[PDB]
Amino acid sequence: TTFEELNTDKFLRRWERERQEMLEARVKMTNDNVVQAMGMMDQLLEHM
Amino acid sequence: SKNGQHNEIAACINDNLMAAMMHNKPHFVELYLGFDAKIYELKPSEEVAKTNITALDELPSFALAIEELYKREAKKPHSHVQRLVSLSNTDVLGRHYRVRDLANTRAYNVLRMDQIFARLVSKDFSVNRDFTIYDSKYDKVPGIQFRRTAQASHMLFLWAICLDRFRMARHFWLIGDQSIINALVASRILERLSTHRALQGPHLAEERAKMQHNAKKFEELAVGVLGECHGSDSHMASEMLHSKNDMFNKKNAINIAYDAKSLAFLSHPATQSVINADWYGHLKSVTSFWAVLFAFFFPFFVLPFINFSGAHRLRRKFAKFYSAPYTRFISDLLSHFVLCVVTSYFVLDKLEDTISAIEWILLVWFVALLLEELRQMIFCDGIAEYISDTWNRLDLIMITLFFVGFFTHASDPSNQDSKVVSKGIHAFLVVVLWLRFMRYYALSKNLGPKLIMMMEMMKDVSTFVFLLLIFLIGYGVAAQSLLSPDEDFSSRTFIGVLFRPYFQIYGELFLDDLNSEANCLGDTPFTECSRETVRMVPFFLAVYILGSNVLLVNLLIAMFNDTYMKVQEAAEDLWRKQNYELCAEYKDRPFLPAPFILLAHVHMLFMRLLRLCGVHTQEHEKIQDDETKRKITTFEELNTDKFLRRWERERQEMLEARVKMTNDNVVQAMGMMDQLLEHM
Amino acid sequence: YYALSKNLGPKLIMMMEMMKDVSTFVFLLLIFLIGYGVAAQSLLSPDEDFSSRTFIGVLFRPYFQIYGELFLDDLNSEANCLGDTPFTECSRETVRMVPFFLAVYILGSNVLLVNLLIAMFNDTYMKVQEAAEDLWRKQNYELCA
Amino acid sequence: INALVASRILERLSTHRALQGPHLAEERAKMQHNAKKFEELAVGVLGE
Numbered sequence: 064t065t066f067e068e069l070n071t072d073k074f075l076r077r078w079e080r081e082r083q084e085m086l087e088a089r090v091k092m093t094n095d096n097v098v099q100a101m102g103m104m105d106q107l108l109e110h111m
Numbered sequence: 112s113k114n115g116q117h118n119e120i121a122a123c124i125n126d127n128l129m130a131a132m133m134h135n136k137p138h139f140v141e142l143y144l145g146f147d148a149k150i151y152e153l154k155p156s157e158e159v160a161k162t163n164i165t166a167l168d169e170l171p172s173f174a175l176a177i178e179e180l181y182k183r184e185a186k187k188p189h190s191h192v193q194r195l196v197s198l199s200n201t202d203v204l205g206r207h208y209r210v211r212d213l214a215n216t217r218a219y220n221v222l223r224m225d226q227i228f229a230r231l232v233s234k235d236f237s238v239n240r241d242f243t244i245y246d247s248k249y250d251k252v253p254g255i256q257f258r259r260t261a262q263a264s265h266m267l268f269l270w271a272i273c274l275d276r277f278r279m280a281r282h283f284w285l286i287g288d289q290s291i292i293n294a295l296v297a298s299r300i301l302e303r304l305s306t307h308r309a310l311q312g313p314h315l316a317e318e319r320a321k322m323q324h325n326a327k328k329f330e331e332l333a334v335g336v337l338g339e340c341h342g343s344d345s346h347m348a349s350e351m352l353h354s355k356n357d358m359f360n361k362k363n364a365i366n367i368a369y370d371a372k373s374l375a376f377l378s379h380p381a382t383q384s385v386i387n388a389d390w391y392g393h394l395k396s397v398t399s400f401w402a403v404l405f406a407f408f409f410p411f412f413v414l415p416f417i418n419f420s421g422a423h424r425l426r427r428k429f430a431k432f433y434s435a436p437y438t439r440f441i442s443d444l445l446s447h448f449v450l451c452v453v454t455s456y457f458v459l460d461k462l463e464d465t466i467s468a469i470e471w472i473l474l475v476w477f478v479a480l481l482l483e484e485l486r487q488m489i490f491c492d493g494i495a496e497y498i499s500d501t502w503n504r505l506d507l508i509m510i511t512l513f514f515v516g517f518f519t520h521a522s523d524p525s526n527q528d529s530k531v532v533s534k535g536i537h538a539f540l541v542v543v544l545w546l547r548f549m550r551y552y553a554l555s556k557n558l559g560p561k562l563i564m565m566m567e568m569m570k571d572v573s574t575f576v577f578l579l580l581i582f583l584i585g586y587g588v589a590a591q592s593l594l595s596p597d598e599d600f601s602s603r604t605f606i607g608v609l610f611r612p613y614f615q616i617y618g619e620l621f622l623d624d625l626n627s628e629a630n631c632l633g634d635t636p637f638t639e640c641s642r643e644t645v646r647m648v649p650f651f652l653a654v655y656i657l658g659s660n661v662l663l664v665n666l667l668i669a670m671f672n673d674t675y676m677k678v679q680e681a682a683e684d685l686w687r688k689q690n691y692e693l694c695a696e697y698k699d700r701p702f703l704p705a706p707f708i709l710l711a712h713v714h715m716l717f718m719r720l721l722r723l724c725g726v727h728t729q730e731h732e733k734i735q736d737d738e739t740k741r742k743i744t745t746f747e748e749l750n751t752d753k754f755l756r757r758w759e760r761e762r763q764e765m766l767e768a769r770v771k772m773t774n775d776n777v778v779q780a781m782g783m784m785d786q787l788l789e790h791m
Numbered sequence: 792y793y794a795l796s797k798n799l800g801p802k803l804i805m806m807m808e809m810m811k812d813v814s815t816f817v818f819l820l821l822i823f824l825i826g827y828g829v830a831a832q833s834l835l836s837p838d839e840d841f842s843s844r845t846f847i848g849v850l851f852r853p854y855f856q857i858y859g860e861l862f863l864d865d866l867n868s869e870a871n872c873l874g875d876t877p878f879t880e881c882s883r884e885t886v887r888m889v890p891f892f893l894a895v896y897i898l899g900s901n902v903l904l905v906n907l908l909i910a911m912f913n914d915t916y917m918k919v920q921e922a923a924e925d926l927w928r929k930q931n932y933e934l935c936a
Numbered sequence: 937i938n939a940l941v942a943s944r945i946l947e948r949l950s951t952h953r954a955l956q957g958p959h960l961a962e963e964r965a966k967m968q969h970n971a972k973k974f975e976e977l978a979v980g981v982l983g984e
């Protein structure tokens with residue numbers, strides 16, 4: 064039971080890591096990050 | 112807008128919007144719509160001369176502006192609009208078969224285009240125009256502004272669907288109302304427009320394809336809004352699908368969709384739920400095909416059949432069970448099956464010296480079918496709709512064959528020759544009867560799509576028949592001349608050219624028979640013959656079966672394989688369309704089987720003579736209230752808005768859109784970065 | 792006992808799947824077979840009482856003509872057509888329509904229905920072909936169990 | 937074991953007797969899809 068729970072946790076961590084290396088997820092992550100980058104850029108220009 | 116210059120926006124918005132429509136810039140048409148662009152306030156560039164027609168003068172200004180667009184588009188070389196107007200063969204007011212100065216200067220008026228599109232959809236689609244709502248006296252009324260937009264949008268919508276501009280069409284579709292019905296109408300106009308008669312040419316091919324593409328997009332729209340309806344309130348969505356619409360002559364939406372040949376709309380769960388609920392009637396959907404048949408054979412063991420919906424309960428239960436279309440289909444199947452078995456027995460068994468009892472039973476049965484066919488002809492939408500069905504063609508041919516054969520036997524029953532000729536005609540009757548029995552295979556998810564595939568492969572055979580005749584006639588004339596030379600032409604020569612050559616393509620070789628006919632006397636088949644020319648028959652044949660059995664038959668197998676992949680992918684859609692056609696056909700079918708449908712026929716005729724005529728007391732009228740109609744329209748607009756918001760959200764999650772958005776955003780990020788470094 | 796093999800095993804599962812495809816074919820062919828058989832049997836032997844031989848006659852040739860075996864010499868003998876050309880000098884003019892009915896029938900049977908079944912077989916093979924390994928591993932367990 | 941049980945319930949649920957109708961077709965497909973996902977889970981942990 065302990066071995067099975069540990070391997071369940073290992074699979075899901077590995078599954079999440081594998082799913083983050085997909086093209087769709089990386090493009091989605093890149094898009095949201097650039098939007099957040101311009102928010103930080105707006106904050107910078109205000110400070111200037 | 113922020114600086115209070117809204118009046119200047121409103122003064123120039125109509126011409127600017129007009130210019131945007133002329134120069135094919137959809138993004139600019141949306142931009143303008145919302146900043147007070149009133150589609151009904153358009154003005155023509157030139158002034159139209161009076162034409163002494165009360166219909167043409169009663170038009171609004173926005174009405175001459177849709178014409179000017181058609182004239183500008185039409186004056187360009189090889190424009191399909193001018194060819195369609197010319198091939199329509201109508202006058203200036205849109206009246207059929209009535210085609211001067213009035214016919215050429217105002218050939219592209221909105222009323223004439225409305226009539227052409229109305230004839231393009233179906234035989235019963237009429238869009239009622241009411242231009243009077245554009246008067247200043249109809250201004251204190253609350254909701255008119257919506258009506259004026261919707262009507263105006265509709266006219267522009269029809270123009271934008273015609274020139275195949277999907278984006279402007281979709282926009283004007285969004286401005287107006289009856290979104291689902293308008294999308295189906297748009298799909299129908301693009302599909303009919305894609306073939307018609309003017310666009311038939313090879314060079315217009317890519318162009319017609321575009322139309323079909325556009326067609327697909329619009330039904331996709333029609334499905335989509337509906338889907339939201341199915342995921343917002345299923346029963347109210349069902350009420351919308353059962354709702355009688357004013358443009359078509361009180362046809363519901365599923366019938367409109369079937370007439371528009373929209374397979375995607377018909378395959379939708381909401382549409383299928385309405386068709387399935389109508390199909391099973393007041394019978395639980397989970398009732399066996401076996402259970403209903405057994406209950407048909409055993410009506411007093413049917414009390415425990417399935418949850419449904421003294422005297423007024425047993426009687427009510429019998430009237431609901433025998434009023435269901437599924438039960439009527441099962442009764443018609445069994446009845447037609449007995450007709451096939453009994454008629455097959457009748458043709459196989461010997462005819463008597465007088466009209467036998469089984470012959471009289473079949474005579475009564477086919478009159479009853481003839482009366483049923485006459486009933487179907489009177490109670491339909493049209494003669495063209497009836498004759499379109501392949502099963503109606505098969506039933507008319509089978510009734511016609513039986514009566515020719517019977518009268519042939521009945522003219523002289525004590526005659527051997529009459530019996531032989533009559534049985535010869537009745538052979539064709541039994542073949543067409545068993546072919547007509549395949550109609551009841553359509554309920555099954557395996558057997559149904561296969562009939563459609565069979566009619567498609569019948570089209571492939573005809574192509575094969577055209578290709579084979581070359582080999583068959585050429586080899587047959589050549590081979591028949593080589594086998595039997597110096598013989599006068601007769602009917603036997605014609606039978607000889609066609610018989611063996613055709614049957615040699617199925618692997619049956621007549622080489623022993625051809626050896627006997629060649630008069631070649633030897634253990635080796637073609638050596639010791641009287642004439643040396645007959646030794647070339649095995650060679651001609653050698654080429655021929657290489658051409659026929661190996662090349663043409665296998666080429667047909669390849670055509671069949673393509674045809675199967677084609678009807679295989681849309682087997683589900685075609686089965687769902689057949690599902691509707693079964694449901695529609697059995698709603699009006701009297702329940703009693705075919706021999707016993709004479710009692711039902713005389714009962715309906717007696718009822719018809721009594722009611723809705725002299726000394727009548729029975730009349731039914733079921734008209735929907737205005738409240739439920741306004742509920743369906745508001746619900747439909749809300750679900751249209753929900754679909755488009757969901758559609759935009761889904762389209763922004765696509766890979767192409769996200770990559771495009773990411774690219775433009777990074778470019779803007781460097782612009783902001785340039786501004787930063789300058790500040791530093 | 793073929794199920795242990797990686798080639799022979801998945802093929803039995805495919806055979807039971809194509810047995811299901813035949814049953815569909817049987818339902819589609821009966822229409823042509825019974826219709827042509829009743830029509831052809833009536834044209835060949837008219838004015839004869841119904842018996843078990845009539846029933847054997849409707850089913851025998853029509854079924855065996857779908858495999859390319861033509862009974863044209865036998866049908867010529869049964870039609871009582873006395874001539875070098877097979878159907879000209881017959882006693883009755885109705886029997887000259889047998890070669891035509893047959894002409895439609897084998898076009899329907901040997902060219903259209905059999906090849907349609909071949910297409911169904913091709914789909915069935917692609918279907919059990921992709922999961923041939925999975926089905927073999929399930930048979931592996933069933934042998935083991 | 938729960939993932940296998942989930943796969944079994946979705947596959948049996950996908951046909952059963954109530955969902956037999958033509959209009960529930962897309963719906964049952966979804967079930968099968970879900971079924972596939974859960975056995976994928978059952979395989980995955982096992983793989984670890």
Ligand SMILES: CC(C)CCC[C@@H](C)[C@H]1CC[C@H]2[C@@H]3CC=C4C[C@@H](O)CC[C@]4(C)[C@H]3CC[C@]12C
Pocket residue numbers: 508512532535536539543884885888
């Ligand atoms: C639409 C299809 C199914 C119907 C075809 C019409 C059939 C039933 C008709 C058309 C021509 C007819 C033939 C015309 C003449 C003769 C010669 C006579 O001595 C025997 C019957 C025979 C051979 C007829 C049999 C029936 C016949 C073949």
Ligand SMILES: CC(C)CCC[C@@H](C)[C@H]1CC[C@H]2[C@@H]3CC=C4C[C@@H](O)CC[C@]4(C)[C@H]3CC[C@]12C
Pocket residue numbers: 576577579580583606609610613878879887888889890891894
């Ligand atoms: C290109 C291919 C499909 C050609 C079509 C073949 C058809 C037209 C040919 C092939 C075999 C032919 C039949 C062969 C023999 C006979 C017997 C004769 O007493 C009457 C005509 C009849 C019944 C012929 C009618 C026409 C026929 C059916």
Ligand SMILES: CC(C)CCC[C@@H](C)[C@H]1CC[C@H]2[C@@H]3CC=C4C[C@@H](O)CC[C@]4(C)[C@H]3CC[C@]12C
Pocket residue numbers: 643644646647650
């Ligand atoms: C270009 C294609 C058609 C190839 C041509 C080959 C033809 C012309 C050949 C192939 C087989 C040949 C036949 C074979 C044998 C004999 C027997 C001989 O005693 C007379 C000629 C005759 C009857 C030949 C005639 C020509 C023939 C038919």
Ligand SMILES: CC(C)CCC[C@@H](C)[C@H]1CC[C@H]2[C@@H]3CC=C4C[C@@H](O)CC[C@]4(C)[C@H]3CC[C@]12C
Pocket residue numbers: 637638646647648649650653
């Ligand atoms: C590899 C394959 C395609 C070989 C080609 C087969 C050809 C060359 C063979 C097959 C059958 C043969 C024919 C069989 C019988 C005869 C009758 C004889 O009196 C003259 C030759 C003739 C007419 C032969 C000519 C050659 C022939 C047509």
Ligand SMILES: CC(C)CCC[C@@H](C)[C@H]1CC[C@H]2[C@@H]3CC=C4C[C@@H](O)CC[C@]4(C)[C@H]3CC[C@]12C
Pocket residue numbers: 884885887888891
């Ligand atoms: C629509 C389809 C079925 C085509 C119809 C073609 C049928 C009706 C034709 C094709 C071949 C024809 C037969 C060919 C030759 C003869 C011989 C003649 O002395 C009597 C009629 C008879 C026996 C014909 C009857 C009609 C016939 C069977």
Ligand SMILES: [Mg+2]
Pocket residue numbers: 284285286287288289290748751
């Ligand atoms: Mg709307």
Ligand SMILES: [Mg+2]
Pocket residue numbers: 484487502503506
């Ligand atoms: Mg009919």
